[PDB]
Design a protein around this ligand. Structure first.
Ligand SMILES: *[C@@H]1O[C@H](CO)[C@@H](O[C@@H]2O[C@H](CO)[C@@H](O[C@@H]3O[C@H](CO)[C@@H](O)[C@H](O)[C@H]3NC(C)=O)[C@H](O)[C@H]2NC(C)=O)[C@H](O)[C@H]1NC(C)=O
Ligand SMILES: *[C@@H]1O[C@H](CO)[C@@H](O[C@@H]2O[C@H](CO)[C@@H](O[C@@H]3O[C@H](CO)[C@@H](O)[C@H](O)[C@@H]3O)[C@H](O)[C@H]2NC(C)=O)[C@H](O)[C@H]1NC(C)=O
Ligand SMILES: *[C@@H]1O[C@H](CO)[C@@H](O[C@@H]2O[C@H](CO)[C@@H](O)[C@H](O)[C@H]2NC(C)=O)[C@H](O)[C@H]1NC(C)=O
Ligand SMILES: *[C@@H]1O[C@H](CO)[C@@H](O)[C@H](O)[C@H]1NC(C)=O
Ligand SMILES: *[C@@H]1O[C@H](CO)[C@@H](O)[C@H](O)[C@H]1NC(C)=O
Ligand SMILES: *[C@@H]1O[C@H](CO)[C@@H](O)[C@H](O)[C@H]1NC(C)=O
Ligand SMILES: *[C@@H]1O[C@H](CO)[C@@H](O)[C@H](O)[C@H]1NC(C)=O
Ligand SMILES: *[C@@H]1O[C@H](CO)[C@@H](O)[C@H](O)[C@H]1NC(C)=O
Lengths: 430, 107, 122, 102, 431, 125, 430, 109
């Protein structure tokens, strides 16, 4: 054939690959993702290039998970332990400022050792019922929730966990491909693909039934699932219009610093000032009714005309039955019943508040959120919904990674392989 | 652009975590440089050899097909011969050096 | 509201000392307590930061007339006087501004709620 | 810190007034940490205002200027009932008290 | 002649480096690196090499990793610090009579999950795990509360030995000796190159070497300076002796909560055969095995008939035969195996829950009890013997490196040295 | 044959595998990963140090390189037929082990002198 | 024509990590043998800028020393369980007479197992103990207010053996060889080295001990002479011999804390009653200060100069604090700095709870040292601060000042091998 | 460093030259960066390499050859410190053109 091997370097080819991506820009996120972002991101149109994307198997979702857990632990590790407080609590009924009672709170007295490890004193603090477990029946004696399962630590008030956009960048030798076709939906070939080095910034917002502060779908509402005919394989609905949600805790809380040891203190909840309205979230009614109807119209493209209906979660604890909204740093567990209630000016969701949480289903670990003094107001953008199937749908919930997959679905990591060969009609001259 | 013309045919197409990442970047770099050098492409983006195309790796009339195939498709087409070709390229370069220093008729 | 009941004390002729305190209607120690001097003299002055909330300090009524003192067991607190003198022949009262965190030291942003009936021994 | 206010001889009804305090110390690093209270003859003092806001569970007839040197004029003096009232420099350990004039 | 420079020359030097460990088990978790699915071996024709099993540093390196994994695996587990309390330790009864000396019923006052609450609890302990505080006052403590903390191993964590292959990094190679009569030191005239060693299970034992490979030829006696009495002799058998060990009773355990998610596991009661653990070695096999060892031993000591004696004395950790059987540590007598001059042999065996496997000053481990009964079966592949008219041999022992030298005797680690020079007829040309 | 398989071959037969031996010098959770990281860093340094020597000797990019340094019979007085046909590389490495540092120093100096002469002494004025 | 050169003799200022190089902390980490025959190259016609107060090596060494200190103490005995109420009375020594500064204190400690509450006692210094209330025998340790106290283990020495710091490949250390260099200007006689000389990491406050004496006359170095906010480092060309002592035989006990832990504490003192004192040659001291002043007046030629026997701040800085073997001395310098332009026998105090580094949250407890102790040291410099006439006072107290005075002549630079220059020729083969 | 500071024409033949991991890795990175740059330029393997880029007279006042030997490298580097990235870019562009011209102007057997 008179052909000889010609070696070429700088060949535009690649392979699917999994590598370590790095993130870029008193805030924990800002401290860790200290690396500057690209002020002028580049993008290559990749003329005549098609590619296979698979969000459900995208390793970046899992890698982002590992980074959030790791960062959380670095931040929480060098802080006060509350295990010295795992004592019997002598509790009475709910109390409040002046002639009132706060349902959901209890006034508890406890025996705390002073810093000299000999003298002992009693202290009083208010606690949420959801953070307290009764020791026996017909008894006033209680203990803190989880003193029978794990160490409880206190988050340091000095550090902010407020989400900031995080940009992920591939290391040298790697690139990130993006699907920019729109209406991509689930897995499969994308016929409009481009190359970038870094992702858009994604804020690490953690929630359950409602996905907050993400990007909006371009075009129509997109329903993403893995084999949509299944009851499992949680469905991610990505809205093209946002819904404003305003959440609040309309009362003035105070904080008491209790010394618990040689360089340690606990932050206790003291008297609460103002009216007692618990907590709640405000959603416009017409906005919700129209938004849900549009979702249904898109469900009708996957399902035949059917008896489509929405119901509240069928069971489990607050972590899966409510909207686990972080708001201002106290944790909100808001009731979505009345939101996911339909058959095919505003409404409010009643909401509960907690201080002791187990984060990403750590279970064997727990964290205590110091109380926030004064009142709290939070406004967020609902950008997507999470649904599961029984055509009855319920919010269900995910593995707490759906709040990443919903943004990372358009990105893929590939290894660049610049070396290759092909035959040519040219023999080496010597 | 870096991967621009990736979908074009050959005629045109041819024209602690941080320490781990840095080490890998270096290892990938060094492997490409060693491998190009060991075949006689040190200092070049493109070079030729004395190793013939066997026709068994691919039996296509590539002198014309070259302009109607992309690098991505080609890379898949002959991926099973990667080590064979590379081994032959290594042998070719080593033999050339042995001929250069042949004592009977040296350089 | 603590609504504390002043214990009162006998008057002395510039002699001995007193720490009568006031008995709280609810709780003890906790994190809502205060002690003050009282007089028909621009309401006298705060006597002690008998704040509970795991802390205590003297206030401005006198540099060294009394020291903050308390007993959770008695549901009561007062600064304990020493070296009584005629200048001290005045009223005293209890209050319970709620504790709060305010960076360094403290500020009584909360009002001096629950003023006691008070007592005097002049 | 120091407090005083020119509220002497405040003999009035219907029309509310108060004198502003000396506010030698602004006492307002955050949230106006200063407060007002008043007492009727033969009575304990009670909060009138705090951080220039009507005290909780006190009275509708309460107001104060948004200033360190605020005057806690009643919103109205319809009830008359003049009584001694004073501000305190709550921010200070030495929370100096005003004269407590009627 | 002229100097010629070469790169890629197939030569090497003795070298030291870190080898890769290739394989809810700790070894599997740690040695997460897969083994070579099809290991290669290249015979080096016309190559000789010098091997020395007493000095190759492969044993020392794995020692450090064995210790590191053991300790690291135990770190994220329950501490028994709060158990250092006075114990009553009265005579425990399994059934009928209170005649079992080994177990005591220890009652004590221990802090529970709430810091302001304390409870009276009890558990059964072995005599070998406790010490009397005051003679005849019936006050006892755990033996290691004298010097350090005792860590309870996690019940979910398996320390079961799995075969481990050690693999060279790029730039290094492992040379293997293929001489069946090598004896542990000196030149091998048949050498091959491998990337990874054969798999070795990290089995820890004393006196007898268990679950190793067998000698290719006849019994090989390997020792440094065999004529000295200051050296340990490793005897590598060419046939395995089957040994079976058991604890013939059903143990039931309790759980005492001592903190916010932490609990102590301990014997509650034992139902079954009240006797101690037993090990069974076939008699005919043992006598044949020993006779065969002696026939080869006579080549080093061709004199008066050899006497085999029991171990000389010292702590139980060095005088008896230790067993890593399941989760319980067996301390078995060898008397009757080493009482001779040159159908089953039943040996009594004690069990302990508190051990110090690596004789570390700062460490102690508590083994949670096995619920139910245990049967342990193994291959005796060799012996660790010491020597001290005729010769006297005893089932003595070393530092547990013997356990690894016995497999890692045929391997050497070398570094590749690609550069060198040689004379030629060719001078560099000017061009 | 592969990797060190040619190690026992004669000096002449050996080297038909220089490429193989050279490519095999490159590599293609917790604390134990640090020891592995350290090993990788050192492997890179060793590779580069050999490349630095080839650079300074003027042998960069070649597996077989000649120089302008004559062979000193002091280092070895054997002829080429013995050296290339009977002797192996392991034996040779031992035979002249005490001259390696001399030859390397000479190679560096020779290359520097060559470069000194190659350098253009302002021909263009 | 652009000619490209590689290996070009150019360097730039740079900051990197220097090598630690070379039962003993310093030896454990700085465990790499030094160059047995250091080389040095004189750079003819080269001038370079050195600046003592901008020299990052001072700060780097400081951070590394702190790390070495903590790393050494970490794997040792905690004294946490001893932060209990103590019952203290007056201690006596030698005779029935009370020895001032020592108190005889008892306490209830667990020791073996649990619930023993064994009554133990020890002698303590008043400087380490704070009274709990008025008119009371009850006391607590001073660090109970902030943190745990770590006992230093006798097994390890902290002796300041000299360390030579070495630059990494790609870097070099430039040295100033001007005998009268003032610390901020250009040095007109410089050379290049790879390692610094051996600098002993000596810890002191007001006086600089065991350094290298000036090559020239006494050199007075400060960032700014005029600015009274700056520290003046006086570098002497002649040393002062200092002999300090604790003239008594201490006997110590060992109090079991728990398994693996024990407290070392003073049992009794037999010997002199004076706790400590120090011998400074009278003639040397008087002449030394006069010489400093004669030089000080060329910077401050104003009226008269006086050295006032005064200092401010607490005991850690108002005195001369230094280690004596493993002992901690606090000597009164009022007997030294008292002059306007045999031996001094200064009184000295001893303290055991040392807040080394003056950091909040850390303390170390110095075990008692048995028998009697003497130390000899060389004053090689002084630290002064100031403000018609001018008043100077002992200053210092900042540990970095003790190192700045030795590293003053060294600078770290990065080597930059590439550069270009114009030539006559174009590449010949194109 | 070795000898340094001499007037540039005297520099001929003088061209003869967890924290621990970070230091070693960076030393490697710096080494390779210089080699990569010499690599893109037609300079790999050389101490001295000649270009196809004229010196641009706009950069400094070139008093013929005197500028090449009237100071050492330290002052020279300062004089043209603001052109280094320009010169390097020009050298890359020129070599890139050379690579394209050799690629197209194939000889071969
Ligand atoms: C600029 O700095 C140079 C240092 O970088 C100074 O050079 C030093 O001068 C010393 C004499 O004054 C030499 O001392 C010699 O050291 C050797 C060591 O082995 C001894 O044997 C000799 O006896 C000793 N000579 C004498 C007379 O004692 C230093 O070796 C030498 N250093 C170097 C690196 O050469 C310059 O003097 C200085 N110039 C100015 C103007 O100060
Ligand atoms: C300033 O330098 C001097 C001289 O090196 C230092 O003096 C030395 O201090 C050490 C520690 O106290 C002494 O070591 C001890 O010596 C006795 C001798 O019997 C021995 O039994 C001990 O075990 C220990 O090794 C050393 O002898 C002493 N040197 C001299 C000449 O007396 C001084 O400590 C340094 N000062 C400062 C502040 O660093
Ligand atoms: C609840 O607490 C907040 C502060 O935590 C108070 O906020 C202040 O409100 C006034 C209103 O005029 C502002 O002028 C101040 O500047 C605010 N403070 C700060 C720090 O911003 C709020 O008033 C409190 N509410 C009640 C009912 O007490
Ligand atoms: C809180 O509980 C303690 C329990 O002893 C009780 O004394 C106290 O009065 C309670 N507080 C209130 C406000 O009722
Ligand atoms: C240990 O003592 C307890 C006391 O209640 C008893 O119930 C238990 O059966 C005893 N156990 C044994 C094995 O003797
Ligand atoms: C003693 O040695 C002889 C050979 O010298 C042998 O035949 C005999 O069996 C030996 N005795 C014993 C007990 O082995
Ligand atoms: C003050 O300075 C003058 C300068 O001439 C000197 O003579 C005088 O002795 C100095 N005063 C004192 C106290 O030394
Ligand atoms: C050293 O100090 C002692 C303290 O008692 C004193 O007696 C002695 O005289 C001093 N030395 C000199 C030279 O004065």
């Amino acid at each position: 054939e008179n052909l000889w091997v010609t070696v070429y370097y700088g060949v535009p080819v690649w392979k699917d690959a999994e590598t370590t991506l790095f993130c870029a820009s008193h805030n924990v996120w800002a401290t860790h993702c200290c690396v500057p972002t690209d002020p002028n991101p580049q993008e290559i149109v990749l003329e005549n290039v098609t590619e296979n994307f698979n969000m459900w198997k995208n390793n970046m979702v899992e890698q982002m998970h590992e980074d959030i857990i790791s960062l959380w632990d670095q931040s929480l590790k060098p802080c006060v332990k509350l295990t010295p407080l795992c004592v019997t609590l002598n509790c009475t009924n709910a109390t409040a400022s002046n002639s009132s009672i706060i349902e959901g709170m209890k006034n508890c007295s406890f025996n705390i050792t002073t810093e000299l490890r000999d003298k002992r004193e009693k202290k009083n603090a208010l606690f949420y019922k959801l953070d307290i477990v009764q020791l026996d029946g017909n008894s006033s004696q209680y203990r803190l929730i989880n003193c029978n399962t794990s160490a409880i630590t206190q988050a340091c008030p000095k550090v902010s966990f407020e989400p900031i956009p995080i940009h992920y960048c591939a290391p040298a030798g790697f690139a990130i491909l993006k699907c920019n076709n729109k209406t991509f939906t689930g897995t499969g070939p994308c016929n409009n693909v481009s190359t970038v080095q870094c992702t858009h910034g994604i804020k690490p917002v953690v929630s359950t039934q409602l996905l907050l502060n993400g990007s909006l779908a371009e075009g129509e509402i997109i329903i993403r699932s893995e084999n949509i005919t299944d009851n499992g394989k949680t469905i991610l609905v990505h809205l093209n219009e946002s819904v404003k949600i305003e959440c609040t805790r309309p009362n003035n809380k105070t904080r008491t610093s209790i010394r618990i040891g040689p360089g340690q203190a606990f932050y206790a909840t003291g008297q609460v000032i103002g009216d007692i309205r618990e907590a709640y979230c405000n959603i416009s009614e017409s906005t919700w009714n129209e938004t849900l109807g549009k979702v249904v119209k898109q469900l009708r493209k996957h399902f035949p005309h059917k008896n489509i209906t929405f119901q509240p979660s069928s069971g489990g604890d607050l972590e899966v039955t409510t909207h686990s909204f972080n708001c201002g740093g106290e944790f909100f567990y808001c009731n979505t019943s009345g939101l996911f209630n339909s058959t095919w000016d505003s409404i409010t969701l009643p909401c509960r508040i907690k201080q002791i949480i187990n984060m990403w289903q750590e279970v064997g670990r727990a964290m205590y959120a110091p109380p926030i003094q004064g009142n709290i107001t939070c406004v967020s953008n609902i950008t997507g919904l999470i649904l599961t199937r029984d055509e009855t749908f319920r919010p269900g919930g995910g593995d707490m990674r759906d709040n990443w997959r919903s943004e990372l679905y358009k990105y893929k990591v590939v290894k660049i392989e610049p070396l290759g060969v092909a035959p040519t009609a040219c023999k080496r001259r010597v | 652009g870096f991967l621009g013309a990736a979908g074009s045919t050959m005629g045109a197409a041819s024209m602690i975590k941080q320490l781990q990442a840095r080490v890998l970047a270096v290892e990938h770099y060094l492997r490409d440089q060693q491998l190009l050098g060991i075949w006689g492409c040190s200092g070049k983006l493109i070079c030729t050899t004395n190793v013939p195309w066997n026709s068994t790796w691919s039996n296509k009339t590539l002198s014309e097909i070259w302009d109607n195939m992309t690098w991505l498709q080609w890379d898949k087409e002959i991926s099973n011969y990667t080590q064979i070709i590379y081994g032959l390229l290594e042998e070719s370069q080593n033999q050339q050096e042995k001929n250069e220093t042949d004592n009977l008729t040296c350089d | 509201x603590x609504x504390x009941x002043x214990x009162x004390x006998x008057x002395x002729x510039x002699x001995x000392x007193x720490x009568x305190x006031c008995x709280x209607x609810x709780x003890x120690x906790x994190x809502x307590x205060x002690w003050x001097x009282x007089x028909x003299x621009x309401x006298x002055x705060x006597x002690x930061x008998x704040x509970x909330x795991x802390x205590x300090x003297x206030x401005x009524x006198x540099x060294x007339x009394x020291x903050x003192x308390x007993x959770x067991x008695x549901x009561x607190x007062x600064x304990x006087x020493x070296x009584x003198x005629x200048x001290x022949x005045x009223x005293x009262x209890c209050x319970x501004x709620x504790x709060x965190x305010x960076x360094x030291x403290x500020x009584x942003x909360x009002x001096x709620x629950x003023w006691x009936x008070x007592x005097x021994x002049x």
